[PDB]
Amino acid sequence: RQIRPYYNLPSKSEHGRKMTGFLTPYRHWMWKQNELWRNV
Amino acid sequence: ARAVIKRRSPQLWGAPGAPIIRMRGHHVVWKFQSYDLVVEHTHKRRNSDIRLLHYLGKHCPHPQKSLWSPDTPVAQDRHLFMLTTVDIDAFKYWFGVKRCRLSMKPWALLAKAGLLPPSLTQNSKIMPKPLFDKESLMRYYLANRKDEDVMAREKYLNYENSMVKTEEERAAERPVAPYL
Amino acid sequence: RSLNVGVVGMGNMGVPIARNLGFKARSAMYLQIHSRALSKAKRVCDDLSVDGATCAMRIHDRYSTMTKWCDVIVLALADVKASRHALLEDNESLIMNARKGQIIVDHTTVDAETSRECAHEAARRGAYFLDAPMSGSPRACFNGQLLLMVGGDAETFQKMLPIFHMYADNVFHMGESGSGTAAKMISQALVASHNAAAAEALSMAHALGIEDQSKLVQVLDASWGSSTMLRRNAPLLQDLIRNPDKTPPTSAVSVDRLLSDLAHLDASLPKRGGEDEPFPVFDAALRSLAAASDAGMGDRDLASVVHYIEAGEAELRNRT
Amino acid sequence: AIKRSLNVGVVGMGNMGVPIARNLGFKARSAMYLQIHSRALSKAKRVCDDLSVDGATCAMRIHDRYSTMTKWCDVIVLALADVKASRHALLEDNESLIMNARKGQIIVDHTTVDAETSRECAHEAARRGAYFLDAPMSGSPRACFNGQLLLMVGGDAETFQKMLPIFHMYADNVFHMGESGSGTAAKMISQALVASHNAAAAEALSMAHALGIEDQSKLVQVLDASWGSSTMLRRNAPLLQDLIRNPDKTPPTSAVSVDRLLSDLAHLDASLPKRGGEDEPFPVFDAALRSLAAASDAGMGDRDLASVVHYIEAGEAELRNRTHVPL
Amino acid sequence: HANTQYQHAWPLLSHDDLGNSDQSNNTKNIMYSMYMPKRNKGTAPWFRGADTYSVKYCEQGRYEYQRYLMINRFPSEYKKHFLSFLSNIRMSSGSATIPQEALHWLLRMIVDNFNPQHVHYIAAMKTLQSAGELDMARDVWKIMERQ
Amino acid sequence: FRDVEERRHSRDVVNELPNPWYDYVAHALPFPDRDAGYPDEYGDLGQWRAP
Amino acid sequence: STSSRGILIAGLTNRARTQMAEGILRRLTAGTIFIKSGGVHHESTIHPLAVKVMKDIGIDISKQSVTSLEAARRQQNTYDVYISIDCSYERRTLDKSQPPRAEVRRRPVRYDPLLVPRTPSHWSVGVDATDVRRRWQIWSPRDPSIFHETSTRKFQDHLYEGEPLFMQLRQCPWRTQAKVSERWEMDEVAIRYPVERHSAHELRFVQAREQLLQRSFDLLTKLEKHYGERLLLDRALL
Amino acid sequence: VAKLQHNSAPTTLNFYEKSFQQLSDVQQRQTGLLIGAAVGDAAARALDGYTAEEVAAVAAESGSLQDEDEDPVVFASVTPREHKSGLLRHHSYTFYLFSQLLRVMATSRGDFPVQYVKNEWVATARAHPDCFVREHASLLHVLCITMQLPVIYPWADDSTLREYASGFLEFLTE
Amino acid sequence: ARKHGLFYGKMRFAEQKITFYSDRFLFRDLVNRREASYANVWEMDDPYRFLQTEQDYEDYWGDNYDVYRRMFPEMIGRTGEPVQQYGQMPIWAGPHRQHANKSEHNWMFAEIGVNVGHEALKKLELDPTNEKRRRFVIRQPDGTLRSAKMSEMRAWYWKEEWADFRFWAPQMEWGIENTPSQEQYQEHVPDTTDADFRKQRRIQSRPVKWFYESEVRWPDVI
Amino acid sequence: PHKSYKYTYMPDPRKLAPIETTQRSEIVPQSIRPPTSYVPNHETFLERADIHRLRPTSDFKASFKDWNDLFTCDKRQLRVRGIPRMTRDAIRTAVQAFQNGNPPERFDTKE
């Protein structure tokens, strides 16, 4: 399951989902750190 | 891939998916519950008359007392036993050759069995996850970098054949008698 | 917005709760302080300076100003007469005239009649009143550990629980208003009873000739006769019994405080009968405490009753 | 002078004697021969049969005569109901254990007894050459089944050290108070504290009902948080609350009975030193005694200790009448 | 709650409930297996409690029970199987197949009751030589000779 | 991680013993190597379907 | 008088370390604070080396007794201080017959501190090996509901019915309800290693005694700060 | 027979204590050869290199016996004068080679040529150069290495054992 | 053990077997086995020589004789098999996962499969000298991987509930009428040049660390 | 009964064989993470975890006394307290994620 943290990019749309898959640069960096630990 | 999908049990790809090893449970009360470590497709083949590709073993969740305490006693002999069966040759065939998937409960059980290392989810709260630093990692690699030929031989023995004949074996294989 | 919470009754007990509230902060809560003195206002100002502007504190000495500014008001007053003066007797006060929907809480040990009158007047005016007497020490309340015997409206208690937890560790709501005061009275009565019982038991032990007093205390605390009062007062009582010449040492909580607390219980409990003697053990404990207090040892400690254990029987014989 | 197992005997299959024997049988990994004495052999048969069916790890032997019990057991433990039975079994019978004791036997009586009886028993055991311990047990039979009892042993320190592995099979808190009779004195003190705290808890819940507090759990919580916590109060809060709410209800029976508590306190009073014509003026203790006596004078002596709440005022009225008689 | 289920154990040399005893001849003893119900739906605790098998079972050598059976197939099936085995043998050892697999497939072809053709042997040897497995090529030649 | 673990394992002497579950594959043929008795090739009482 | 509702010292055996800690605390506080030392397993006696090494300091612990903390579990919210004396899990052994194992080494091998974090100290312990309590259960075959063949109240499938007085271990996650709670990581000094000498065992007891004294001083400093009272009275052990 | 349970006395003192009963007499002797060799080497490792008078001095110095401790000479707690790295702290180079040969024998499951252990032995020699020159091609060293060869077949006669051990001794003295 | 209200019987024979009078070879086998068998075995006889000390004597003859005799039918010079512990596979996760293999219970695993689980081959499958022996493992609550005892291994097969109090193997006849011959074993003609599976198994067993060094010679230091 | 046999009813020796127990707390302890700035109190923690309509955690904020009570609470304790199955499962999962190092930061999907 792909996590959707509250601090992601909010899509101000009344016709679809209220949150977007775009993430802050910190989330990208943190995700890489978790990726490295699973790579082990 | 369906008009109205099965919301209560979806999957990731089409049917029948890749083989996956999982502990199929029965539909009985908890008191007499037991699991079957079996390999089956990603989508359950409950429709057809053939449900599983292979039967690996059976696991009993309820611990039983040591019925062999009067035998030769060792350390922690009198603790409760959790009896379980596991096929080894079939597991290794499906895991290495066929490259089947693996769930988390079978992974933990095989970690206990010693076939596989402890699972990804078998994490304690004592220590958090490691933090990686590229410069430190590169420094450690430079400090401890293995030889090219040594690493090649190690991976060749691990992956290709490990039954490599020596010079003595080759000489013994070579005919020496009058060649007929 | 954020709740406007005011504190009235600055003192050795009033200051720590406001200090803890300011330290916790976590919002823009406005704290109005009823200092009634420029020195106390300056104390609030330097406390704010030490805290580092965690909460906005404004000192005002008008009950009307507190009513119109603070949605929630807390009272920490030493004496019940002062509590009555500041809550009901005053022309402005808090319960008598206040904005509807305003929460008023008092931690002062008040009698059941006073609590019932406060609740009735608060209902008449349209405000919510709940009584939460405090159990603990000034050090305990500074550290953030108090036992609040909360009693009043359930929804108001649930609303106030996060505020109470900013300066208390254990919070309990016993149904309705006045039950907190009743629980505190029962707690003080049991404290006195256990103190007298422990003193008499150790006197009996000494008379029988028990040497290993530490082992005796361990046995008593492991048996059914275990009590926190005994486990606390065992060494001092043992020393007093071993050498009766020594005067009891001065302590923070003492027989005068216990008598003042039990006076509220005596007033609150219906005095119907009297000759019936509904509570002999409590009566004997009160007699011994009063004799120990009025015979000089009025401010030393609760262990002073070991030398006046016979006073309960003596007073009973004199009266009867 | 041969190598064998210890002959451990238990005398008295009452209410507390059965859990002790069951614990010994279960936790003795064939390290002792368990002798069980009974006045009626049917009780011993029943106890041994139940232990065997439940699964016992040590062989057992039933007895109905103190002479056979003495000739067999190397260590004897007596768990009786009252003081008269213990005195008869130890000193008065022709086959009395202490009088017929062998040089080296260890006799431990867990029954609560009086100071004079304990002193005479210890003196007779010392004269015979055996070893005697008075270890008044504390706790309910369910607590003895759980093994979390309380023992206050007075007597020989070496004997206590030797008997420790047997005590731990049914008691976790064992305290070697000191010389002989110290366990009896500690038991008297504990019983007096228990009675005083029971009276205090009953009065506290009565005044709680009078004031209007309509919940006992929310009161015991704050009491335990504060300094007014007491084991008797915690144990008796619900029953006392129910009895106060409905006076018509008759308090139930329990192992700790009003009659037994009164007997123990009477032993304590008898062993209490006097100051001449007048006794020691303990107000709280006297009030508890009067209330318990009033409760027992209503046929409630065999019921639970919580019955004192209904007779607080009965004791007060009796005291007022007795004081007005000479006035 | 009294003991009404257990009973005292049978003493040594005791007699049966039917008078049977293991003394002298068994003629006085009477068999009772014919009074039991003929078929039990389940397994009694005394059902086949202690049975033994022939010593030949544990003394046999490996693969000494396989009788030679002639499994005949259609000629088209023979062609299909030969082509499939040849393709598997000639599968390249790029990244997922180790060179041992050619020898494994030749052995599998023999085990599945087939006669490896000269094209199969040539392909196995050439693949092993292209992978550098001279010992495995010698093993393929030994397999051909042993066939 | 791999290098540290391998160094620790090599230095450790308790875990140098072979593990039969981890070291080898026992039997990889589709059929057992010894005759356990089955099959029967005959029916029994009450079995009408034979073969 | 004091304002402390009691101190509990929790061990797995209550043989040497807990007894020494209780003696040191009582000596330092002059017996003004009620201290109860108990262990989960009470089937043991006070160690002669422990009492000897405490007499070598001036504390007589021979008068104490090996007890369990069941009375403390019955009224645990009453007590104020809860100190659990336990061994480190990195060095802990279960057979109780071997010397403790080596722990994780940070910068044999040394692990990177970032790749192997050091269990942050600002956290708190929820449950410990010493937080367990005993639980005795008996499945008597005399009960027909257990004697019934299709009964789940038995660890045996076919051998027999019931189970004679088996013991389990519950847990008490109530250590955080106390006003002060601490854990002391010290190696066990009650048992003897296969080749241990008497002098070496005595030295281990001395080291454990020094560690207990330092931890007791720190704990009493913390308690004095907490209560505002004067607990370090007998300052003659420096 | 049986004693009252107290102080939580462990049931077994070692993992194989009750397992050693599960061997025949000859199997017990076979295992005893190797295990006694290991125990003696580990017990004498502490005073390795010490002289007779130094051992006597150690025994005299540790003259405070409590009637249950082992002899001070055996498993002595003296400070190490060698400070080896990972394995020779508890044993010697000779026992290192002995253990390597034992492991090779166990993995061979019967008789085996010396080439199965040549590489392990030369790797150990390279890892410990000082020990190799110190104790190479000596009678004590080769004897301690080859002591375990008759464990392969205890019923073998002298001629067979010598013929089998000739190959090992040739490489040991090469 | 006798239940209340239930009548019991006695098994005349342990199993349904063929009598030895039916064939002349069965008769000879039985008379030879009876010759090698004790008429009455006692505590001091040869089969009970594995009880060296009084601890073994008391353990075998007290409170556990039933299980000790039901462990194995024939009387051998022991009661079970020695237990040896295995080595843990390295875990690249490091100390982040060393705790996961410890639990509160003994985790017992037994191999099953096509070649394993045959009741008729229990002796040969549990023979320790079998290269294809059935694999058992036990993970203790402290993470130790050990083997299984004889009783633990036999618990997975159908129970055998008989015992032998007479036959003792070392007393078997040899020389007269009993002479195992090398010719009978060599009639199979085991040839290493013909079949090389034996060499393959030997190569699998022998170490492989020589491969990283690419004649073996001692180091030279001067 | 017989006067010559110990254990007159002859129980199986495995019946008298003892049982040993070892709690999981001895294997590994449970640490409690102190509250952080994102979740200063258990009310805030429950509000953050309240992201699903069917399992509202915020409705039971008053049930938990404090942070220690919330993090030491068991599922059996929750069932005793009277918290419905889905909500208590969500609360336990959020607590376990926080213990493993994942704060309850997600998207509220109710709207």
Q: Within the 150-209 window of chain D, which residues sit less than 8 Å (CB to CB) from chain C?
A: 150, 152, 173, 175, 177-178, 182, 185-186, 188-194, 196-197, 199-201, 203-204, 206-208
G chain contacts of residue E45, beta-carbon cutoff 8 Å: 158
Type of residue numbered D85:
A
User: Chains with ≥3 Cβ pairs under 8 A against J?
Assistant: A, B, C, D, E, G, I
Tokens encoding F11: 């230095």
Query: Do J22 and I64 lie within an 8 Å CB cutoff?
Result: no
User: Chain F within 8 Å of B96 (Cβ-Cβ)?
Assistant: no
Task: Give how far Cα B93 sits from Cα of B87, C186, C301, D184, Å.
Answer: 10, 75, 81, 75
User: What resolution in angstroms, rounded to 1 decimal?
Assistant: 3.6
How close A8 gets to chain B, by Cα (Å)?
23
Tokens encoding J96: 């376990």
- Assign 3-state DSSP to chain A and report helix, strand, coil percentages, each to 5: 40, 5, 60
CA E9/CA I66 separation, integer angstroms: 14
Q: Which residues of G are annotated as a binding site for Mg(2+)?
A: 37, 65
Among C47, C55, C53, smallest CA distance to C30 is for C55
Contacts of B7 (CB under 8 A, 6+ apart): none
Give the CA dihedral G58, G64, G68, G70, nearest 10 degrees: -110
Please say whether the beta carbons of B163 and I203 come within 8 A: yes
CA G30/CA C192 separation, integer angstroms: 26
State which residue of chain B sits closest to F1, comparing Cα positions: B137
Between chain G and chain H, the number of residue pairs with CB atoms below 8 A apart is 31
Q: Do chains B and C touch (3 or more CB pairs under 8 A)?
A: no
**Which residues share a beta bridge with J32?**
G124
CA H19/CA A30 separation, integer angstroms: 53
Packing angle, helices E118-130 and E100-111, rounded to 10: 160
Between chain D and chain E, the number of residue pairs with CB atoms below 8 A apart is 8
C chain contacts of residue D234, beta-carbon cutoff 8 Å: none
Please say whether the beta carbons of G14 and G21 come within 8 A: no
Tokens encoding J24: 């999981």
Indicate if the alpha-carbon torsion angle C242, C244, C250, C256 is positive or negative: positive
Q: Within the 283-322 window of chain D, which residues sit less than 8 Å (CB to CB) from chain C?
A: 283-288, 290-291, 312-313, 315-317, 320
Contacts of B147 (CB under 8 A, 6+ apart): none
HEC-encoded secondary structure of chain C: CCCEEEEECCCCCHHHHHHHHHHHCCCCCEEEEECCCHHHHHHHHHHHHHHCCCCEEEECCCHHHHHHHCCEEEECCCCHHHHHHHHHHCCCCCCCCCCCCCEEEECCCCCHHHHHHHHHHHHHHCCEEEECCEECCHHHHHHCCCEEEEECCHHHHHHHHHHHCCCCCEEEECCCCCHHHHHHHHHHHHHHHHHHHHHHHHHHHHHHCCCCHHHHHHHHHHCCCCEHHHHHHHHHHHHHHHCCCCCCCCCCCCHHHHHHHHHHHHHHCCCCCCCCCCCHHHHHHHHHHHHHHHCCCCCCCHHHHHHHCHHHHHHHHHHC
> Beta strand pairing status for C147-150 and C170-173?
parallel
Please say whether the beta carbons of G76 and G173 come within 8 A: no
Which phi and psi (to 5°) does residue D247 adopt?
-65, -20
User: Beta-carbon neighbour count of residue G225 at 10 Å?
Assistant: 12
* Determination technique used: cryo-EM
Please say whether the beta carbons of F18 and F25 come within 8 A: no
Tokens encoding D45: 């048969």
Q: Do chains H and G touch (3 or more CB pairs under 8 A)?
A: yes
Please report, for chain A, how many H helices and E strands are present, in that order: 1, 0
Mutation site, G89, G109, G152, G163, interface B, largest B CB count within 10 A: G152
Tell me which residue in F2, F18, F33 faces I92 most closely, judged by beta carbons.
F2
User: Beta-carbon neighbour count of residue G27 at 10 Å?
Assistant: 21
**Which residues share a beta bridge with C171?**
C148
CA G134/CA C261 separation, integer angstroms: 42
CA D222/CA I82 separation, integer angstroms: 61
CA angle J16, B112, I93 (to 5 degrees): 145
Tokens encoding G187: 């190696």
CA I70/CA I68 separation, integer angstroms: 6
Contacts of D320 (CB under 8 A, 6+ apart): C275, C277, C320
HEC-encoded secondary structure of chain D: CCCCCEEEEEECCCCCHHHHHHHHHHHCCCCEEEEEECCCHHHHHHHHHHHHHHCCCCCEEEECCHHHHHHHCCEEEECCCCHHHHHHHHHHCCCCCCCCCCCCCEEEECCCCCHHHHHHHHHHHHHHCCEEEECCEECCHHHHHCCCCEEEEECCHHHHHHHHHHHCCCCCEEEEEECCCHHHHHHHHHHHHHHHHHHHHHHHHHHHHHHCCCCCHHHHHHHHHCCCCEHHHHHHHHHHHHHHHCCCCCCCECCCCHHHHHHHHHHHHHHCCCCCCCCCCCHHHHHHHHHHHHHHHHHHCCECHHHHHHCHHHHHHHHHHHHHCCC
Among D233, D242, D245, smallest CA distance to D201 is for D233
